[PDB]
Structure 1
Amino acid sequence: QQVTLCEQYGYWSGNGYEINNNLWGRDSATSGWQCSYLDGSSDSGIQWHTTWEWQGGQHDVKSYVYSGKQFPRGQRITSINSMQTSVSWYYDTTNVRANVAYDIFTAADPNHVNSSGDYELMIWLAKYGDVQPIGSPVGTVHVNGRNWELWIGMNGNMKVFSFIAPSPLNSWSGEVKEFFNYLQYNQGYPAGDQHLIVFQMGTEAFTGGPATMTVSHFSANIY
């Protein structure tokens, strides 16, 4: 690929996008490895893939390698008109324990560290193996023209909302404001007090492989 990132927290930046070989939970594994590969980038989005094998620590995420959209700090969720995103992705195998998910952090502190937030909003486009979101399911919700199983729970002091697609969504053009709006008016999410911290798409890897997730296209448009 045009660039290869194998070390933990390996990093690429370009065209207002970034990729992080974010192997944050790798110490939970008895064995394994993972790289992220930039296939191409332009202002209109990027193309990348990641290959990994992880064994051991069955219930612990080893990594969340991601492509992130860059944006200025200090954007209040209620000031954002649109958080549109498009992604096309596919795994080269069914038999992994992993998901494919957008990860979004918000915090009242606009300078919050990018590794967490006051709140976390996940959109799980797919779920492989028996992997489960944070918390417990609260029912099926209609957001952005689709149905999702909404899970809610706490990761430490961070409240986590995970919207789970009922079947894998290998290609998706979404309006992430819809999910924030849903949460603001149905789950008491204080959107007017929160700032966008990160906006990422990637895969949480638990166990399995060697497996490859290919992102044919990833773009986001925040305005």
Structure 2
Amino acid sequence: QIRSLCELYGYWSGNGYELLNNLWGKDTATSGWQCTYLDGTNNGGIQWSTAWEWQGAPDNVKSYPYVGKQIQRGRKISDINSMRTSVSWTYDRTDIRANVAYDVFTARDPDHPNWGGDYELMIWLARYGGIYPIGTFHSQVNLAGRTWDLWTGYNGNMRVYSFLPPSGDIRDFSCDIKDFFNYLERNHGYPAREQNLIVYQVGTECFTGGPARFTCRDFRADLW
């Protein structure tokens, strides 16, 4: 690895991306730890991984290590033209409680801290070990050439929209996240003209299990 980010909130940034050992829920674990590794910054993308083992509190997320696209504040979603992104990943085992997911926060306040927002949009690419998304299953949605199960609910005051694969995982994925925002704006009244982009990330929520390793073979994200 080029960098080993094993401290709580170990951080790297470069090439318009950032990488965080985001062990935000670690105090709910009885034992374990996790490290996030920068493997490369080749070809306008990021190559990274995270190794972990967590025990205790199986319904509690211990971490969401991620790679994020750095963004300027104040980009109203309505005026974002495109958010084209691709990811190729693997997990070394699937007998774990964990996901792989894009995470996007938006807020009316353009300076909202990156830990949350008024709304959250997740695009899940894996669902391992019987974990649940936020909220309840709403309906199926056709976007990005796939069918998704849309779940909706609340995490505190934040409205959360999660798009899940009906079955299996998606280890090689590309989409334009604006298609997902457009679907929510039209059919769910999502206030895109009032909402500012806060974060734009992909990573793995880790609940329990391991030793396990998530490898991101490549991540690219653009914003126009």
TM-score of the two chains, using structure 2 as the length reference: 0.98
Q: 1:210: which partner in 2?
A: 211
Aligned partners of 1:14 and 1:57: how far apart in 2? 35
Aligned partners of 1:33 and 1:162: how far apart in 2? 27
- Does residue 71 (structure 1) correspond to residue 71 (structure 2)? The answer is yes
Q: 2:51: which partner in 1?
A: 51
Aligned partners of 1:9 and 1:3: how far apart in 2? 13
Amino acid at match of 2:173: W
Report the alpha carbon displacement of residue 145 of structure 1 after superposing the two structures with TM: 1.8
Tell me, which stretches of 5 or more residues in structure 1 are unaligned? none
* 4+ residue segments displaced more than 2 Å: none
Aligned partners of 1:113 and 1:94: how far apart in 2? 33
Report the alpha carbon displacement of residue 144 of structure 1 after superposing the two structures with TM: 1.9
Aligned partners of 1:4 and 1:109: how far apart in 2? 34
Amino acid at match of 2:119: Y
TM-score of the two chains, using structure 1 as the length reference: 0.99
Q: 1:35: which partner in 2?
A: 35
- Does residue 170 (structure 1) correspond to residue 156 (structure 2)? The answer is no
**RMSD in angstroms over aligned alpha carbons?**
0.7
Report the alpha carbon displacement of residue 68 of structure 1 after superposing the two structures with TM: 0.3
Aligned partners of 1:143 and 1:63: how far apart in 2? 28
By percentage of residues, which structure has more strand?
1
User: How far does the alpha carbon of each residue in 1:66-117 deviate from its partner, in whole angstroms, 9 at most, with x for none?
Assistant: 0000111110001111100000000000111000000000000000000000
Amino acid at match of 1:130: G
Amino acid at match of 1:179: F
Q: 1:150: which partner in 2?
A: 150
Tell me, which stretches of 5 or more residues in structure 2 are unaligned? none
Q: 1:109: which partner in 2?
A: 109
Amino acid at match of 1:127: R
Would the aligned equivalents of 1:15 and 1:42 in 2 still touch at CA under 8 Å?
no
Aligned partners of 2:99 and 2:113: how far apart in 1? 24
1:71–1:42 distance in 2 versus 1, CA, 3 Å: farther
Q: Give the stretch that moved more between structures: 141-150 or 49-58.
A: 141-150
Indicate the percent of aligned positions where both proteins have the same amino acid: 61
3-state SS, counterpart of residue 222 of structure 1:
coil
Amino acid at match of 2:47: Q
Q: 1:128: which partner in 2?
A: 128
Aligned partners of 2:60 and 2:164: how far apart in 1? 19
Amino acid at match of 2:72: P
- Does residue 189 (structure 1) correspond to residue 190 (structure 2)? The answer is yes
Aligned partners of 2:165 and 2:47: how far apart in 1? 23
Would the aligned equivalents of 1:39 and 1:47 in 2 still touch at CA under 8 Å?
yes
Q: 1:13: which partner in 2?
A: 13
Number of aligned positions between the proteins: 223
Amino acid at match of 2:135: G
3-state SS, counterpart of residue 181 of structure 1:
helix
Report the alpha carbon displacement of residue 62 of structure 1 after superposing the two structures with TM: 0.2
Amino acid at match of 1:21: N
Aligned partners of 1:118 and 1:145: how far apart in 2? 28
